[PDB]
C-alpha cells in the first residue's frame, strides 16, 4: 500500500534489486485512505468510517 498525497497526479515506486524466479505479474487498484483500516493494529483510532 503506497500513499498518494492529496492532489498528487504521479506516484513513483520502486523495489531494490531482487530475484524474480516464479514471479507471476502485477495486480493494482486505488483506495481511499479513510476507507482503509491499518492492518498492523489491534485497534485503529483514526479509522473513523464504517
Amino acid at each position: 500500500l503506497y500513499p498518494i498525497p492529496a492532489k498528487a497526479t504521479n506516484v513513483p515506486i520502486s523495489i531494490p534489486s531482487r530475484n524474480w524466479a516464479a514471479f507471476r505479474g502485477w495486480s493494482f487498484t486505488r483506495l481511499k485512505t479513510k476507507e482503509t483500516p491499518s492492518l498492523g493494529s489491534g485497534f485503529d483510532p483514526y479509522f473513523v468510517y464504517s
Binding site: S38, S41, G42, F43, D44, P45, Y46
Partner: protein, 59 residues
C-alpha cells in the same frame, strides 16, 4: 569556533490499553434464555384466564 565546542551539542504511535481497571472471567453461564420464554408463556396464561372470566360471565 571555540570555548563551547569542547563538549558536543512525529504522527501516530497508537497505543490502546490506557488508564482503566483490571478484568476477570468465569464459565457458569446462561440459564437466562429460558425466562424469556417463561415470561411470555405466563403472560399468555394471564390473558387465557381473563378469557375464562368472560366466557363464564357470557353464560
Amino acid at each position: 569556533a571555540a570555548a563551547a565546542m569542547t563538549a558536543t551539542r512525529m504522527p501516530s504511535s497508537g497505543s490502546s490499553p490506557s488508564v482503566p481497571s483490571s478484568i476477570i472471567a468465569e464459565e457458569k453461564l446462561l440459564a437466562l434464555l429460558a425466562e424469556l420464554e417463561a415470561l411470555s408463556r405466563q403472560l399468555a396464561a394471564l390473558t387465557q384466564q381473563v378469557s375464562e372470566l368472560r366466557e363464564q360471565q357470557q353464560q
